Amino acid sequence: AASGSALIFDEEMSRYKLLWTDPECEIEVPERLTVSYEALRTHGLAQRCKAVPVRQATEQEILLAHSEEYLEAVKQTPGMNVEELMAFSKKYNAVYFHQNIYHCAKLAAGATLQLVDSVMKREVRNGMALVRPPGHHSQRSAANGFCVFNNVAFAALYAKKNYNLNRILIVDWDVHHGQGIQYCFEEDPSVLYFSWHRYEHQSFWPNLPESDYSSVGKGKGSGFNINLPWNKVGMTNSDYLAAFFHVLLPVAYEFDPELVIVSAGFDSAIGDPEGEMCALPEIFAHLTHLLMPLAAGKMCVVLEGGYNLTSLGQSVCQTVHSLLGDPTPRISGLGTACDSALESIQNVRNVQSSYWSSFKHLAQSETDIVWPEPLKRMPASVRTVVVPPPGVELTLPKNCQHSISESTAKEVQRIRDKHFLTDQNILRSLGNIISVLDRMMRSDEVCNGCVVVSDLSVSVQCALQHALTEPAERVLVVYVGDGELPVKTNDGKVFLVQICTKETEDKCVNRLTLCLREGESLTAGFMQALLGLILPVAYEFNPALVLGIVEETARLMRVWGHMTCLIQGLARGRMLTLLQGYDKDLLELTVSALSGASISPLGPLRAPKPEDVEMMEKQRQRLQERWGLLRCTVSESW
Ligand SMILES: CN(C)Cc1cn(Cc2ccc(C(=O)NO)cc2)c2ccccc12
Numbered sequence: 360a361a362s363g364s365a366l367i368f369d370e371e372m373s374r375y376k377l378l379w380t381d382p383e384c385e386i387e388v389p390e391r392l393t394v395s396y397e398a399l400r401t402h403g404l405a406q407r408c409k410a411v412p413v414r415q416a417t418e419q420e421i422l423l424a425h426s427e428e429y430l431e432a433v434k435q436t437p438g439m440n441v442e443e444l445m446a447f448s449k450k451y452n453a454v455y456f457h458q459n460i461y462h463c464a465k466l467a468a469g470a471t472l473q474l475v476d477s478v479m480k481r482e483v484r485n486g487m488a489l490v491r492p493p494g495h496h497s498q499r500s501a502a503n504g505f506c507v508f509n510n511v512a513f514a515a516l517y518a519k520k521n522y523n524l525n526r527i528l529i530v531d532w533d534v535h536h537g538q539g540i541q542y543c544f545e546e547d548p549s550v551l552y553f554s555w556h557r558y559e560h561q562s563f564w565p566n567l568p569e570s571d572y573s574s575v576g577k578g579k580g581s582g583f584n585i586n587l588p589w590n591k592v593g594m595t596n597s598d599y600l601a602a603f604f605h606v607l608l609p610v611a612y613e614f615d616p617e618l619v620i621v622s623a624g625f626d627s628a629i630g631d632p633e634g635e636m637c638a639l640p641e642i643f644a645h646l647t648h649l650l651m652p653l654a655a656g657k658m659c660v661v662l663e664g665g666y667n668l669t670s671l672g673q674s675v676c677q678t679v680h681s682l683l684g685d686p687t688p689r690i691s692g693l694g695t696a697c698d699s700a701l702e703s704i705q706n707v708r709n710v711q712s713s714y715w716s717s718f719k720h721l722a723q724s725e726t727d728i729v730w731p732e733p734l735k736r737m738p739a740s741v742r743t744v745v746v747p748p749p750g751v752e753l754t755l756p757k758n759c760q761h762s763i764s765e766s767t768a769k770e771v772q773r774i775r776d777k778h779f780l781t782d783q784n785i786l787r788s789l790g791n792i793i794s795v796l797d798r799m800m801r802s803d804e805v806c807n808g809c810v811v812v813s814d815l816s817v818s819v820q821c822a823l824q825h826a827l828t829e830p831a832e833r834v835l836v837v838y839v840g841d842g843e844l845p846v847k848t849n850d851g852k853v854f855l856v857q858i859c860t861k862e863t864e865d866k867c868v869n870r871l872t873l874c875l876r877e878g879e880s881l882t883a884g885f886m887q888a889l890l891g892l893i894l895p896v897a898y899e900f901n902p903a904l905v906l907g908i909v910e911e912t913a914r915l916m917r918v919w920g921h922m923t924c925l926i927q928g929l930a931r932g933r934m935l936t937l938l939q940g941y942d943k944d945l946l947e948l949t950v951s952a953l954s955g956a957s958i959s960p961l962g963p964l965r966a967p968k969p970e971d972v973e974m975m976e977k978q979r980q981r982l983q984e985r986w987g988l989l990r991c992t993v994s995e996s997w
């Protein structure tokens with residue numbers, strides 16, 4: 360039932376700064392907070408968010424993650440002059456103190472708890488806290504790397520204590536390793552920590568052996584710590600997405616967290632003087648979007664780093680846009696991750712194979728920098744149009760509508776006379792397809808839609824052909840059914856995904872046909888193919904429209920909502936779904952996911968059939984030379 364997105368911010372946290380010269384700490388300025396909040400106001404994003412006030416974290420709350428000794432020492436810094444503050448700062452690595460930093464540290468922490476309470480009390484769907492000082496380097500008895508208290512560690516400990524969550528996922532996409540977080544949950548299997556980070560074979564700060572891929576956690580927590588070290592600078596959108604499709608998401612959906620907290624440091628973005636990576640701000644729209652179907656959307660984004668004020672503003676907007684549900688921007692130029700990234704990726708996957716299903720088949724062997732300003736993102740006036748069979752009034756979610764103009768009806772006749780003849784109620788189906796498609800493609804007024812149809816072949820043809828004419832340069836087709844369709848994948852403008860019951864050997868590289876064995880194992884197998892095959896091809900293909908098609912036959916579709924939601928990362932969310940036959944369940948589920956609603960978790964799934972994982976790896980072997988984003992190992996050289 361929850362709706363809205365929280366934005367927790369307060370200008371008080373910009374009221375401490377570095378007071379002596381120190382080239383390591385110069386980069387961390389109050390303007391990081393000012394610039395990010397002002398960027399959100401300029402784009403009308405703050406105004407769309409529920410402003411939740413900051414509060415101070417209590418002493419009891421700080422002691423969840425820090426020791427009395429260290430809190431006591433920090434509590435004396437407001438009484439210190441600058442000489443004493445310099446001496447106290449020098450006891451720690453890469454941190455400076457200020458008469459107001461204890462105050463703001465308590466606010467940055469309390470802000471995070473406010474966000475956790477709003478989300479877990481269902482007052483909002485998700486949210487973001489813009490805070491200073493950052494947290495993820497902070498440790499039980501020490502400040503480190505601009506961090507005083509560990510805001511994100513707080514949030515998970517607090518969520519554990521006050522809501523009795525058994526499973527919390529923390530995603531740390533800052534460019535630095537959140538070693539404070541890793542230390543805090545090393546032995547705790549109830550918190551899964553994922554972190555990518557510039558490493559460079561341990562030559563990059565904080566220079567820690569245990570920032571490497573081999574630190575998987577300790578004791579009962581083995582396998583719930585996941586480090587992906589970047590060993591070269593300049594990592595791109597393709598590296599980040601390869602990290603998500605082939606490491607993070609396969610683990611996250613199996614973990615099935617009850618809450619997601621994000622250490623959202625944007626020094627991993629292009630232009631940052633410290634990360635020196637190359638991912639565009641747009642990538643964060645997708646990082647956010649790909650995590651949103653977890654935990655019924657309960658996602659708390661907490662700011663960490665980000666030092667290029669321009670890069671910083673644009674990545675914060677891209678994140679809030681996606682929290683608010685705005686359509687995701689198209690990512691072009693995707694391909695293989697670079698070789699160093701594939702090394703890191705395959706090493707993490709191999710070492711994690713002891714602990715996670717999706718990787719288990721790897722163990723047995725029988726199996727001034729400037730860039731283009733991001734485009735405006737804007738919620739469609741009506742997000743989803745729906746065309747149920749004639750005479751079915753239905754309870755539509757808040758942003759939906761039902762169904763034909765003279766222009767349109769003229770066109771259906773032209774198509775009728777040239778290519779078909781037919782005289783039926785299909786003539787209504789095809790008029791609906793066209794008028795829905797025209798609202799999707801022509802206007803930013805409507806985003807996606809679902810039409811119930813009866814005749815499959817004619818419906819598919821008119822939908823596909825009318826789309827290529829608008830023109831939609833490329834169309835991704837996702838078809839759950841058997842047989843072949845009036846779809847030609849020979850010119851490179853169409854890619855066909857087919858989920859079917861009979862195993863049919865496909866030849867060329869513009870078709871991905873998945874035939875999974877029947878039974879209780881089918882749900883886990885579908886999610887593996889979705890995350891590790893379908894999504895990487897689709898993102899590289901970068902279609903302008905997605906056309907979904909479901910045969911009346913298949914029943915076993917507890918997964919359709921997850922794909923509908925993930926697949927809206929492509930084509931700015933422009934997806935038309937054709938449902939063959941009526942099924943109030945499937946139609947209400949499709950419309951709900953299309954409309955941006957919360958998706959219900961999958962929970963525990965029976966791990967997939969070896970015959971299923973083998974068939975999928977046969978598809979990856981067959982397609983990954985054309986679609987490099989499918990690769991999760993370094994390629995063999997001649
Ligand atoms: C490289 N630069 C010219 C100066 C410099 C800053 N630091 C500390 C630091 C801590 C944390 C974060 C962060 O954003 N974490 O998420 C960013 C920076 C250093 C440490 C060792 C050597 C040099 C430097």
Ligand SMILES: [K+]
Pocket residue numbers: 531532533534535536537554555556
């Ligand atoms: K990180």
Ligand SMILES: [K+]
Pocket residue numbers: 544545546547548549550551552576580583584
């Ligand atoms: K853990």
Ligand SMILES: [Zn+2]
Pocket residue numbers: 533534535624626663664665
């Ligand atoms: Zn950082």
